[PDB]
Short mmCIF file of C-alpha atoms in Angstrom, two decimals:
data_model
loop_
_atom_site.label_atom_id
_atom_site.label_comp_id
_atom_site.label_asym_id
_atom_site.label_seq_id
_atom_site.Cartn_x
_atom_site.Cartn_y
_atom_site.Cartn_z
CA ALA A 1 5.65 7.93 18.44
CA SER A 2 5.34 4.87 16.49
CA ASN A 3 3.60 2.14 14.52
CA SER A 4 1.69 -0.25 17.02
CA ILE A 5 -0.27 -3.44 15.93
CA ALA A 6 -3.82 -3.15 17.13
CA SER A 7 -6.20 -5.94 17.88
CA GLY A 8 -9.39 -4.65 15.55
CA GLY B 1 -8.05 13.57 44.52
CA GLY B 2 -10.62 10.80 42.79
CA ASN B 3 -9.57 7.30 42.14
CA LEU B 4 -10.55 6.76 38.32
CA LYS B 5 -10.80 3.48 37.04
CA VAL B 6 -10.32 3.20 33.02
CA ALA B 7 -10.30 0.01 30.81
CA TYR B 8 -8.85 -1.18 27.25
CA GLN B 9 -11.10 -3.71 25.17
CA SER B 10 -9.35 -6.46 24.56
CA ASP B 11 -9.90 -10.06 24.37
CA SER B 12 -6.59 -11.13 25.01
CA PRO B 13 -4.30 -10.70 27.81
CA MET B 14 -2.06 -7.49 28.54
CA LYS B 15 1.59 -7.63 27.66
CA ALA B 16 3.49 -5.45 30.08
CA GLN B 17 6.42 -4.50 28.20
CA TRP B 18 7.40 -0.84 29.35
CA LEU B 19 10.21 -0.52 26.70
CA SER B 20 9.15 0.92 23.57
CA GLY B 21 11.40 -0.98 21.58
CA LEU B 22 10.32 -4.59 23.00
CA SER B 23 6.69 -3.62 22.48
CA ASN B 24 4.87 -4.38 19.20
CA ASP B 25 0.92 -3.57 20.44
CA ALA B 26 -1.26 -0.81 20.85
CA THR B 27 -3.23 -2.28 23.83
CA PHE B 28 -0.24 -1.89 26.27
CA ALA B 29 1.09 1.30 24.65
CA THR B 30 -2.53 2.82 25.29
CA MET B 31 -2.53 1.49 28.71
CA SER B 32 1.01 2.69 29.45
CA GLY B 33 -0.21 6.12 29.42
CA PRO B 34 -0.46 7.58 32.44
CA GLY B 35 3.27 6.53 33.21
CA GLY B 36 4.46 8.36 30.09
CA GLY B 37 3.44 6.03 27.15
CA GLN B 38 6.56 3.98 27.58
CA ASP B 39 8.63 7.32 28.36
CA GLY B 40 7.93 9.65 25.36
CA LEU B 41 10.05 12.94 25.55
CA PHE B 42 8.70 15.19 23.21
CA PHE B 43 5.54 17.34 23.09
CA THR B 44 3.71 18.43 19.98
CA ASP B 45 0.75 20.75 18.82
CA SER B 46 -2.19 19.49 17.03
CA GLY B 47 -0.43 19.05 13.99
CA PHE B 48 2.14 16.64 15.57
CA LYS B 49 5.11 19.34 15.12
CA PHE B 50 7.39 18.89 17.81
CA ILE B 51 7.12 22.06 20.10
CA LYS B 52 9.29 23.08 23.03
CA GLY B 53 8.26 22.28 26.95
CA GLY B 54 8.17 18.57 27.11
CA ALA B 55 10.10 15.87 29.11
CA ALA B 56 12.89 17.04 26.37
CA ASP B 57 13.05 19.19 23.52
CA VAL B 58 14.65 18.33 20.04
CA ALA B 59 16.53 21.12 17.57
CA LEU B 60 17.54 20.34 14.07
CA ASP B 61 20.54 21.63 12.05
CA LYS B 62 19.79 20.65 8.60
CA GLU B 63 23.40 22.07 7.61
CA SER B 64 25.13 20.25 10.04
CA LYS B 65 22.66 17.18 9.39
CA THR B 66 22.11 16.41 13.26
CA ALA B 67 19.32 16.71 15.96
CA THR B 68 20.15 17.63 19.60
CA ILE B 69 18.08 16.32 22.23
CA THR B 70 18.23 18.32 25.37
CA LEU B 71 16.74 16.30 28.57
CA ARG B 72 15.24 18.76 31.17
CA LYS B 73 17.39 19.28 34.21
CA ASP B 74 14.97 17.91 36.72
CA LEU B 75 13.73 14.91 34.30
CA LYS B 76 13.63 11.81 36.71
CA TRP B 77 12.92 8.30 36.85
CA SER B 78 10.38 7.15 39.54
CA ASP B 79 13.13 5.84 41.49
CA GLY B 80 14.42 9.50 41.85
CA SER B 81 17.52 8.71 39.83
CA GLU B 82 18.54 11.25 36.83
CA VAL B 83 16.98 10.70 33.43
CA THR B 84 20.56 10.86 31.23
CA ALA B 85 21.82 11.43 27.91
CA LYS B 86 22.87 7.30 28.21
CA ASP B 87 19.34 6.52 28.63
CA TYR B 88 18.22 8.17 25.52
CA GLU B 89 21.05 6.20 23.93
CA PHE B 90 20.13 3.01 25.50
CA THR B 91 16.72 3.34 23.63
CA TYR B 92 18.71 2.74 20.49
CA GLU B 93 20.65 -0.48 21.60
CA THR B 94 17.24 -2.03 22.60
CA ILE B 95 16.45 -1.95 18.97
CA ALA B 96 19.62 -2.19 17.08
CA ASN B 97 21.43 -4.92 19.41
CA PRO B 98 19.48 -8.30 18.18
CA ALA B 99 20.17 -9.85 21.56
CA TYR B 100 17.32 -8.36 23.09
CA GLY B 101 14.62 -9.66 20.44
CA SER B 102 13.28 -6.25 19.03
CA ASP B 103 10.86 -6.58 15.95
CA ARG B 104 11.25 -2.75 15.30
CA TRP B 105 14.38 -2.85 12.91
CA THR B 106 13.86 -0.83 9.72
CA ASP B 107 16.00 1.18 7.04
CA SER B 108 14.79 4.55 8.80
CA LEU B 109 17.25 3.93 11.42
CA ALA B 110 20.37 3.08 8.96
CA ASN B 111 20.41 7.09 8.19
CA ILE B 112 22.05 7.50 11.87
CA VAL B 113 25.93 7.48 10.95
CA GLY B 114 27.25 4.19 12.47
CA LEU B 115 23.93 2.51 13.69
CA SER B 116 23.74 0.02 10.48
CA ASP B 117 27.37 -1.23 11.51
CA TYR B 118 26.38 -1.36 15.31
CA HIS B 119 23.30 -3.54 14.50
CA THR B 120 25.47 -6.19 12.47
CA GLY B 121 27.94 -6.18 15.42
CA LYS B 122 30.67 -4.67 13.37
CA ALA B 123 30.91 -1.90 15.55
CA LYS B 124 30.69 -2.19 19.22
CA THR B 125 29.40 1.56 19.44
CA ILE B 126 26.80 3.83 17.71
CA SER B 127 29.28 6.30 16.12
CA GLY B 128 26.45 8.87 15.18
CA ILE B 129 25.39 9.21 18.46
CA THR B 130 27.25 11.39 21.02
CA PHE B 131 27.24 13.10 24.07
CA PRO B 132 28.21 16.99 24.48
CA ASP B 133 27.97 16.78 28.44
CA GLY B 134 28.74 13.29 28.87
CA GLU B 135 26.70 10.20 29.49
CA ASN B 136 25.86 11.41 32.79
CA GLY B 137 24.83 15.28 31.12
CA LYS B 138 21.54 16.00 29.54
CA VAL B 139 22.19 16.38 26.01
CA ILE B 140 22.38 14.14 22.78
CA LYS B 141 23.63 14.82 19.48
CA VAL B 142 22.85 12.61 16.66
CA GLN B 143 24.58 12.56 13.15
CA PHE B 144 22.36 11.86 10.18
CA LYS B 145 23.49 11.07 6.82
CA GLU B 146 20.61 12.95 5.57
CA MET B 147 17.93 15.05 7.15
CA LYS B 148 14.00 13.78 6.04
CA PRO B 149 11.04 15.98 5.42
CA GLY B 150 9.03 14.33 8.49
CA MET B 151 11.94 15.33 11.13
CA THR B 152 9.71 18.13 12.08
CA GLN B 153 7.19 15.42 13.37
CA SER B 154 6.40 13.18 15.89
CA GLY B 155 6.34 9.49 14.63
CA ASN B 156 9.09 10.28 11.80
CA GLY B 157 10.87 7.24 13.03
CA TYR B 158 14.50 8.60 11.66
CA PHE B 159 15.23 9.56 15.55
CA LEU B 160 13.40 7.93 18.55
CA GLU B 161 11.39 9.53 21.33
CA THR B 162 11.59 7.38 24.52
CA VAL B 163 14.45 6.64 27.37
CA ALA B 164 15.08 3.40 28.72
CA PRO B 165 16.68 3.54 32.47
CA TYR B 166 20.44 1.97 31.72
CA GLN B 167 21.40 2.15 35.29
CA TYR B 168 18.52 0.05 36.29
CA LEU B 169 18.73 -2.58 33.66
CA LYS B 170 22.33 -2.84 33.01
CA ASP B 171 22.60 -6.04 34.87
CA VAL B 172 20.15 -7.63 33.07
CA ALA B 173 21.20 -9.98 30.06
CA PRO B 174 19.81 -8.74 26.90
CA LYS B 175 18.16 -12.15 26.01
CA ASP B 176 16.24 -11.92 29.15
CA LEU B 177 15.25 -8.20 29.02
CA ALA B 178 11.64 -8.37 27.92
CA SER B 179 10.79 -11.46 30.28
CA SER B 180 12.60 -9.57 33.30
CA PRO B 181 10.31 -8.29 36.01
CA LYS B 182 12.15 -4.84 35.65
CA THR B 183 10.36 -4.32 32.09
CA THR B 184 6.50 -5.84 32.90
CA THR B 185 5.91 -5.92 36.60
CA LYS B 186 8.80 -3.65 38.23
CA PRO B 187 9.85 -0.98 36.09
CA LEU B 188 10.86 2.52 36.28
CA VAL B 189 8.80 5.36 34.69
CA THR B 190 9.20 9.00 33.93
CA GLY B 191 5.45 9.72 33.66
CA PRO B 192 2.86 11.80 36.12
CA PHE B 193 1.89 8.35 37.27
CA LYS B 194 3.98 5.40 38.39
CA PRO B 195 2.39 1.88 38.30
CA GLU B 196 2.51 0.65 41.93
CA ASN B 197 1.60 -2.70 40.96
CA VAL B 198 0.86 -4.69 37.79
CA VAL B 199 -0.93 -7.96 37.76
CA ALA B 200 0.06 -9.86 34.66
CA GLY B 201 -2.22 -9.80 31.94
CA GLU B 202 -4.72 -7.90 33.58
CA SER B 203 -4.30 -4.56 35.11
CA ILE B 204 -2.24 -1.54 36.61
CA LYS B 205 -2.70 0.20 39.59
CA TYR B 206 -1.07 3.82 39.12
CA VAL B 207 -0.27 6.47 41.78
CA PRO B 208 1.51 9.97 41.56
CA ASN B 209 5.09 10.04 40.63
CA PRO B 210 6.79 12.45 42.74
CA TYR B 211 9.42 12.74 41.13
CA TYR B 212 7.43 14.08 37.65
CA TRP B 213 8.92 17.65 36.36
CA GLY B 214 5.36 18.85 35.47
CA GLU B 215 1.90 19.29 36.38
CA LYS B 216 1.15 17.60 39.15
CA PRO B 217 -2.13 15.30 38.65
CA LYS B 218 -5.54 16.16 40.40
CA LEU B 219 -5.99 12.24 41.21
CA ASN B 220 -5.00 10.01 43.66
CA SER B 221 -5.12 7.07 41.69
CA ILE B 222 -6.03 5.33 38.36
CA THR B 223 -6.47 1.73 37.89
CA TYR B 224 -6.25 0.45 34.12
CA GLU B 225 -7.88 -2.99 33.58
CA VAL B 226 -8.74 -5.25 30.24
CA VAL B 227 -12.32 -5.83 29.60
CA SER B 228 -13.24 -8.30 26.85
CA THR B 229 -15.63 -7.41 23.83
CA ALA B 230 -18.46 -9.22 25.03
CA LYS B 231 -18.41 -7.62 28.82
CA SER B 232 -17.87 -4.04 27.82
CA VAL B 233 -21.27 -2.61 27.58
CA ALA B 234 -22.43 -4.21 30.72
CA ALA B 235 -19.41 -2.89 32.37
CA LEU B 236 -20.34 0.98 31.38
CA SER B 237 -24.01 -0.17 32.30
CA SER B 238 -23.02 -0.81 35.96
CA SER B 239 -20.28 1.97 36.07
CA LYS B 240 -17.64 -0.52 36.24
CA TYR B 241 -15.10 1.84 34.44
CA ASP B 242 -15.03 5.69 34.06
CA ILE B 243 -13.67 5.41 30.63
CA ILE B 244 -12.96 2.41 28.30
CA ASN B 245 -10.56 2.94 25.33
CA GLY B 246 -10.51 0.95 22.15
CA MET B 247 -14.04 -0.50 21.59
CA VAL B 248 -15.25 -1.73 18.47
CA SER B 249 -17.40 0.29 16.35
CA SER B 250 -20.35 -2.34 16.39
CA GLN B 251 -20.91 -1.42 20.10
CA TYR B 252 -20.86 2.40 19.17
CA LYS B 253 -24.98 2.93 19.14
CA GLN B 254 -25.20 0.65 22.21
CA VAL B 255 -22.91 3.15 24.00
CA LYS B 256 -24.51 5.98 22.66
CA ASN B 257 -27.90 4.83 23.71
CA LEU B 258 -26.21 4.60 27.67
CA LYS B 259 -27.29 7.10 30.09
CA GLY B 260 -24.51 8.87 32.29
CA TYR B 261 -21.88 8.98 29.31
CA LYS B 262 -20.30 11.45 27.25
CA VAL B 263 -19.35 10.02 23.93
CA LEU B 264 -15.72 11.66 22.49
CA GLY B 265 -14.56 11.11 19.15
CA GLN B 266 -11.50 11.54 16.86
CA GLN B 267 -10.19 10.45 13.30
CA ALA B 268 -8.44 7.51 14.16
CA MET B 269 -4.65 7.38 13.09
CA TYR B 270 -5.35 3.77 11.87
CA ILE B 271 -5.32 1.63 8.81
CA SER B 272 -6.53 -2.08 8.27
CA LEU B 273 -5.36 -4.00 5.50
CA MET B 274 -5.20 -7.53 3.78
CA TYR B 275 -1.74 -9.07 3.87
CA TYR B 276 -0.49 -12.05 1.05
CA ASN B 277 2.27 -14.08 2.15
CA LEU B 278 5.11 -13.85 -0.29
CA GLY B 279 8.11 -14.53 1.55
CA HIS B 280 10.47 -14.81 4.51
CA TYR B 281 12.51 -12.34 6.82
CA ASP B 282 16.41 -13.03 7.09
CA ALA B 283 17.49 -12.25 10.34
CA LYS B 284 21.05 -12.55 9.61
CA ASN B 285 20.92 -9.79 6.97
CA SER B 286 17.89 -7.85 8.22
CA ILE B 287 16.41 -8.20 4.83
CA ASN B 288 12.57 -9.52 3.57
CA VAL B 289 12.94 -11.92 0.71
CA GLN B 290 10.13 -12.51 -1.82
CA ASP B 291 10.69 -16.44 -2.38
CA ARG B 292 7.79 -17.46 -1.26
CA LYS B 293 6.16 -20.13 -3.96
CA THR B 294 2.41 -19.72 -4.10
CA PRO B 295 -0.56 -18.74 -6.44
CA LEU B 296 0.00 -15.41 -4.64
CA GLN B 297 3.07 -14.69 -6.90
CA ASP B 298 0.52 -14.05 -9.68
CA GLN B 299 -0.48 -10.69 -9.52
CA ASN B 300 -3.80 -10.98 -11.25
CA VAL B 301 -4.47 -13.61 -8.48
CA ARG B 302 -3.60 -10.83 -5.66
CA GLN B 303 -5.79 -8.06 -7.34
CA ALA B 304 -8.96 -10.62 -7.99
CA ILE B 305 -8.90 -11.56 -4.31
CA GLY B 306 -9.33 -7.76 -3.32
CA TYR B 307 -11.80 -7.05 -6.01
CA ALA B 308 -13.98 -10.27 -4.73
CA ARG B 309 -14.48 -8.93 -1.19
CA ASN B 310 -17.29 -6.83 0.04
CA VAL B 311 -15.81 -4.40 2.60
CA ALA B 312 -18.74 -1.38 1.89
CA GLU B 313 -21.79 -4.20 2.72
CA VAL B 314 -19.74 -5.18 5.80
CA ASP B 315 -19.02 -1.45 6.78
CA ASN B 316 -22.59 -0.76 6.32
CA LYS B 317 -23.90 -3.69 8.02
CA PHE B 318 -22.02 -3.65 11.26
CA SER B 319 -19.82 -0.67 11.85
CA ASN B 320 -22.40 1.92 12.68
CA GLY B 321 -20.55 4.82 10.35
CA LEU B 322 -17.40 4.34 11.76
CA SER B 323 -15.68 2.52 9.14
CA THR B 324 -15.24 3.73 5.72
CA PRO B 325 -13.67 1.07 3.15
CA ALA B 326 -10.15 2.41 2.06
CA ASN B 327 -9.11 3.63 -1.27
CA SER B 328 -5.46 3.75 -0.12
CA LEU B 329 -2.87 2.79 2.74
CA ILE B 330 -2.68 6.71 3.61
CA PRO B 331 -5.68 7.45 6.00
CA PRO B 332 -7.66 10.99 6.18
CA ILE B 333 -5.87 12.63 9.12
CA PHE B 334 -2.93 12.76 6.78
CA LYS B 335 -5.01 15.10 4.76
CA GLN B 336 -2.17 16.99 3.17
CA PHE B 337 -1.37 13.60 1.40
CA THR B 338 -4.51 11.93 0.39
CA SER B 339 -6.28 12.06 -3.19
CA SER B 340 -9.92 11.26 -4.55
CA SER B 341 -8.01 10.44 -7.40
CA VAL B 342 -6.42 7.48 -5.97
CA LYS B 343 -8.65 4.20 -6.70
CA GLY B 344 -8.45 1.17 -4.78
CA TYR B 345 -10.42 -2.07 -3.60
CA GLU B 346 -13.32 -0.44 -2.08
CA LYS B 347 -16.15 -1.40 -4.39
CA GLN B 348 -16.39 -4.96 -5.04
CA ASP B 349 -15.91 -5.85 -8.50
CA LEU B 350 -16.57 -9.90 -8.84
CA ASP B 351 -16.97 -9.49 -12.62
CA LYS B 352 -13.35 -7.97 -12.87
CA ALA B 353 -11.94 -10.80 -10.41
CA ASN B 354 -13.17 -13.72 -12.39
CA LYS B 355 -12.00 -11.92 -16.10
CA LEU B 356 -8.45 -11.53 -14.13
CA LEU B 357 -8.39 -15.06 -13.09
CA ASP B 358 -9.61 -16.39 -16.60
CA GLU B 359 -6.93 -14.33 -18.46
CA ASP B 360 -4.06 -15.32 -15.88
CA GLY B 361 -5.23 -19.28 -16.80
CA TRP B 362 -6.67 -19.88 -13.31
CA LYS B 363 -9.64 -22.14 -15.29
CA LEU B 364 -12.80 -22.93 -13.49
CA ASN B 365 -13.47 -26.56 -12.83
CA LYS B 366 -17.20 -26.73 -13.33
CA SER B 367 -17.37 -30.20 -10.94
CA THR B 368 -15.60 -28.57 -7.85
CA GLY B 369 -16.60 -25.11 -8.27
CA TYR B 370 -12.83 -23.96 -7.90
CA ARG B 371 -10.18 -22.68 -10.35
CA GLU B 372 -6.91 -24.72 -11.26
CA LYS B 373 -3.70 -24.13 -13.01
CA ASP B 374 -1.94 -27.12 -14.69
CA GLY B 375 -3.69 -29.47 -11.97
CA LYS B 376 -2.92 -27.10 -9.03
CA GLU B 377 -5.98 -26.22 -7.33
CA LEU B 378 -6.38 -22.29 -6.24
CA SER B 379 -6.73 -23.14 -2.51
CA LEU B 380 -5.75 -20.58 0.13
CA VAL B 381 -5.22 -20.36 4.07
CA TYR B 382 -6.73 -17.36 5.88
CA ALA B 383 -5.02 -16.21 8.87
CA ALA B 384 -8.44 -14.28 10.23
CA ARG B 385 -8.49 -13.19 13.47
CA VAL B 386 -10.48 -13.39 16.89
CA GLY B 387 -12.66 -10.06 16.92
CA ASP B 388 -16.15 -8.94 18.29
CA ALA B 389 -19.36 -11.24 17.83
CA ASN B 390 -19.45 -10.49 14.31
CA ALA B 391 -15.74 -11.42 13.43
CA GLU B 392 -16.74 -15.17 12.38
CA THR B 393 -19.62 -14.18 10.25
CA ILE B 394 -17.39 -11.40 8.89
CA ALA B 395 -14.33 -14.06 8.01
CA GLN B 396 -17.11 -16.66 6.69
CA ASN B 397 -18.91 -13.64 4.68
CA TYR B 398 -15.16 -13.14 2.72
CA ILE B 399 -15.08 -16.94 2.40
CA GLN B 400 -18.06 -16.93 0.40
CA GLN B 401 -17.34 -13.76 -1.68
CA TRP B 402 -13.85 -15.75 -2.60
CA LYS B 403 -15.91 -18.93 -3.40
CA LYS B 404 -17.88 -16.96 -6.02
CA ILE B 405 -14.55 -16.49 -8.20
CA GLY B 406 -13.23 -19.93 -7.69
CA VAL B 407 -11.12 -19.35 -4.91
CA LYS B 408 -10.95 -21.94 -1.75
CA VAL B 409 -9.97 -20.30 1.02
CA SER B 410 -10.20 -21.96 4.57
CA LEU B 411 -9.35 -20.57 8.21
CA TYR B 412 -6.33 -21.30 9.87
CA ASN B 413 -6.58 -24.44 11.70
CA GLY B 414 -10.69 -24.18 11.55
CA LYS B 415 -10.85 -21.23 13.73
CA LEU B 416 -10.09 -17.77 14.40
CA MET B 417 -6.62 -16.67 15.70
CA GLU B 418 -5.94 -15.11 19.25
CA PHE B 419 -4.38 -11.85 18.93
CA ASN B 420 -0.94 -12.42 21.01
CA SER B 421 -0.37 -15.65 19.07
CA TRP B 422 -0.89 -13.96 15.62
CA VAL B 423 1.71 -11.23 16.65
CA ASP B 424 3.98 -14.13 17.36
CA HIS B 425 3.33 -15.92 14.07
CA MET B 426 3.63 -12.53 12.23
CA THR B 427 7.18 -11.48 13.71
CA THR B 428 8.74 -14.15 14.84
CA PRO B 429 11.94 -14.96 12.25
CA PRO B 430 12.10 -16.20 9.48
CA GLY B 431 8.26 -15.78 9.37
CA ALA B 432 5.75 -18.81 8.91
CA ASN B 433 5.07 -20.87 5.34
CA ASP B 434 1.57 -21.95 6.64
CA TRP B 435 -0.82 -19.15 5.81
CA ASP B 436 -1.47 -17.39 2.79
CA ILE B 437 -4.02 -14.29 3.50
CA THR B 438 -4.17 -12.50 7.02
CA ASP B 439 -5.46 -9.23 8.39
CA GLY B 440 -3.51 -6.66 9.78
CA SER B 441 -4.18 -3.14 11.61
CA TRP B 442 -2.09 -0.31 12.76
CA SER B 443 -2.23 2.50 14.85
CA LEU B 444 -0.05 4.15 12.87
CA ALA B 445 2.64 6.87 13.62
CA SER B 446 1.81 10.15 13.69
CA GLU B 447 3.66 10.84 10.33
CA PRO B 448 2.79 9.95 7.27
CA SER B 449 5.92 7.83 5.96
CA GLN B 450 5.37 4.00 5.85
CA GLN B 451 9.22 3.05 5.70
CA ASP B 452 8.57 1.50 9.41
CA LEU B 453 5.87 -0.54 8.01
CA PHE B 454 7.13 -1.85 4.48
CA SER B 455 10.92 -1.03 4.37
CA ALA B 456 13.33 -4.16 3.24
CA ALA B 457 14.73 -4.50 6.72
CA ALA B 458 11.69 -4.17 8.74
CA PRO B 459 10.16 -7.42 10.23
CA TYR B 460 7.05 -5.20 10.27
CA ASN B 461 6.79 -6.21 6.44
CA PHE B 462 4.59 -9.01 7.47
CA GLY B 463 4.13 -10.58 4.27
CA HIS B 464 7.90 -10.10 3.05
CA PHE B 465 7.72 -8.18 -0.20
CA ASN B 466 10.84 -6.70 -1.44
CA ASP B 467 10.30 -5.05 -4.68
CA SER B 468 12.42 -2.20 -6.29
CA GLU B 469 9.55 -0.19 -7.39
CA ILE B 470 8.04 0.27 -3.63
CA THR B 471 11.41 0.55 -2.01
CA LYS B 472 12.19 3.59 -4.41
CA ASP B 473 8.66 4.97 -3.88
CA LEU B 474 9.60 4.77 0.09
CA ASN B 475 12.64 6.22 -0.32
CA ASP B 476 11.39 9.15 -3.00
CA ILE B 477 8.86 10.28 -0.17
CA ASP B 478 11.55 10.96 2.36
CA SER B 479 14.39 12.10 -0.01
CA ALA B 480 15.79 15.83 0.12
CA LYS B 481 13.56 16.40 -2.98
CA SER B 482 10.40 15.95 -0.72
CA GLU B 483 11.24 18.88 1.26
CA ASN B 484 9.13 20.46 -1.43
CA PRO B 485 5.66 19.47 -0.49
CA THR B 486 4.73 19.55 -4.08
CA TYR B 487 7.30 16.96 -4.63
CA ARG B 488 6.21 14.96 -1.60
CA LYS B 489 2.69 14.83 -2.32
CA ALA B 490 3.51 13.35 -5.74
CA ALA B 491 5.52 10.92 -4.18
CA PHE B 492 2.78 9.94 -1.81
CA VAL B 493 0.48 9.54 -4.72
CA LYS B 494 3.12 7.26 -6.89
CA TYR B 495 3.13 5.20 -3.52
CA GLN B 496 -0.33 4.67 -3.07
CA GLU B 497 -1.02 3.79 -6.91
CA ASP B 498 1.82 1.43 -6.90
CA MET B 499 1.02 -0.39 -3.63
CA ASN B 500 -2.84 -0.78 -4.99
CA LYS B 501 -1.54 -2.17 -8.61
CA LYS B 502 1.23 -4.46 -7.04
CA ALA B 503 -1.51 -5.75 -4.48
CA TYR B 504 1.06 -7.46 -2.26
CA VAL B 505 -1.19 -5.51 0.28
CA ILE B 506 -4.88 -4.53 0.07
CA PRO B 507 -6.11 -1.35 2.17
CA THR B 508 -9.25 -2.34 4.10
CA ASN B 509 -10.57 0.21 6.33
CA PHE B 510 -10.53 3.77 7.56
CA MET B 511 -11.84 4.57 10.81
CA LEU B 512 -12.94 7.05 13.51
CA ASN B 513 -12.44 6.21 17.05
CA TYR B 514 -14.83 6.78 20.06
CA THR B 515 -14.49 6.87 23.91
CA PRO B 516 -17.06 6.85 26.33
CA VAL B 517 -16.71 8.94 29.38
CA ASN B 518 -18.72 8.64 32.75
CA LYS B 519 -20.01 12.36 33.28
CA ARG B 520 -18.41 12.69 36.67
CA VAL B 521 -15.01 12.71 34.97
CA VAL B 522 -13.61 16.02 33.85
CA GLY B 523 -10.70 17.12 31.83
CA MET B 524 -10.61 13.98 29.41
CA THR B 525 -10.21 14.58 25.85
CA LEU B 526 -9.21 12.84 22.34
CA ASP B 527 -7.95 16.10 20.80
CA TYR B 528 -4.58 15.91 19.24
CA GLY B 529 -1.95 18.51 20.97
CA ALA B 530 -3.51 17.93 24.14
CA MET B 531 -0.15 17.22 26.15
CA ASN B 532 -1.30 17.32 29.75
CA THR B 533 -4.53 14.93 29.76
CA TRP B 534 -3.52 12.57 33.01
CA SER B 535 -2.54 15.58 34.82
CA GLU B 536 -5.70 17.33 34.17
CA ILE B 537 -8.48 14.80 34.69
CA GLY B 538 -10.27 14.89 37.74
CA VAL B 539 -13.60 13.71 39.27
#
């Protein structure tokens, strides 16, 4: 589980 | 069984990258789900606490200060080869050896013995990772400097949770690995489905992985595609997709209006925030350097620009009740660590903003309508991002609020920025000097520590602040003293208050997610703690 950049 | 059709809402092309360490975006991380979610190892309960029974188990020994990972005996890659101890260690190399191009270095990884010295090239191995039954065995021991209170929970960031297929990838040069077919169109995976075909930028066709150790899926296939924001509702009306993930809040009412769908929901493990560009990233020394010359160096300016936004008005107008103006960077899903005590920028205060600027010497020029300090005009570039049909309206709305406080703000290159381009701009060292304000959004790790967003060594600190108070806050949250939850709660409150006062970033929104599901589908869920969804779904 990790931090991910979201488009919205 | 059936043939399921799924989409993810995205206006940008898919960036297929099957190695967690080299993939930064939530779009592909989500699309990888049926293939194992970039080869995640551990199961959890609904509170994200590790349990036994997944692809691997983890045991903590707080006296020795170790994690011991045991891979299942029958855990295999989709070519039938064994997943081994070396595949787990190799994940660490994909992030720590700079030749692979990862943007996921962070001070959390410095807590593994030997890992810092491997990262700088002083050591040729990672001394703290060893193999009690050899490289081709199933057991890995990870030696820490100290235990951290979040280690019981997936997403803690202090030990990693995926494998990479070392024997498959070992003759691909590190610099070529991210663009190799072997990590993009033609990977090995460990999940219930394997990607039989991948169309770059567009789609994945999944079929069952016959080597999967676990519950075999009911479905014959899954197609997973991107679909634009402007085409999404029509795709549901025409039954082009059974499920669409990632849909924007502004479409929620339209989606609930549709016949033939169930609409699932969850608390989003999410934050959006406004960033200020305050420095650069030094790749040689893996450190953020807060040395950028800008009006945003003035604390009053940072705070004023936060107080001038009307986030509640925007959320009321457009979000269909799904977005709530954030008071801090820690979202409601982490209920133990939030406080109604904490006040942020969730209420517009134009009078306070103007006062702050007046007090700081940014005097209004009544001819132009903008403020100046010793002849410098208070003008900034806003790298606003492409979004839904309202994104231009919303960005111009903020520009209008900033004009009310005498700040001149203009879009980067006079337009909204495409998402993949924006990610490159944010992550590529040493960072860019040609933006001042931007908006970021995160699908957060399932443990509340934000070391992996803001620590001094992390390129994910997009504005490149480096502040002793913040660094001590971040460390205090994960310290040995924070093994008393009372102490950790107070550390989380202090961090939230200090980030709002320093105002290097401004919290924007918390959110609820929704997903429409065609009524023909059974077994789909948004419940946390569901570990076998892709094997349970059927038509």
